[PDB]
Amino acid sequence: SIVKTMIVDDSAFMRNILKRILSTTNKYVVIGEAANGADAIKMAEELQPDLISMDIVMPETDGITATKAIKEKTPEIKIVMCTSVDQEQKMIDAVNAGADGYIVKPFQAPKILEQFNKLFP
Ligand SMILES: [Mg+2]
Numbered sequence: 001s002i003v004k005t006m007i008v009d010d011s012a013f014m015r016n017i018l019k020r021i022l023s024t025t026n027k028y029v030v031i032g033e034a035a036n037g038a039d040a041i042k043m044a045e046e047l048q049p050d051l052i053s054m055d056i057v058m059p060e061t062d063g064i065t066a067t068k069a070i071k072e073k074t075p076e077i078k079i080v081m082c083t084s085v086d087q088e089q090k091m092i093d094a095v096n097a098g099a100d101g102y103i104v105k106p107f108q109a110p111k112i113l114e115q116f117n118k119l120f121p
Pocket of ligand 1: 009010011055056057058
């Protein structure tokens with residue numbers, strides 16, 4: 001019924017935008033956030049969330065490499081990329097890192113829900 005979401009993005013305004021988008025839904029409860037891949041890896045282990053919204057270019061560590069590490073420890077958590085980069089290769093790298101979804105910025109509110117709802121019917 002409820003899916004514990006965790007938002008990670010180097011842009012703090014971006015984190016707020018998605019956090020507000022998930023507020024109208026009953027289902028997506030935001031449980032934490034991070035601005036870099038390394039903090040995301042530590043928060044993912046501690047928190048043990050059902051869903052991650054991940055940004056690819058971040059200052060501390062790449063978001064794709066963070067995705068691989070997170071899935072290595074816990075495969076069950078579903079990780080969705082949400083990024084300004086839409087290169088075909090990049091998507092290839094993301095799915096090879098264990099990603100379950102790809103969101104291309106710029107987007108609208110409805111797309112975030114319909115993509116998230118694909119993995120959580
Ligand atoms: Mg970024």
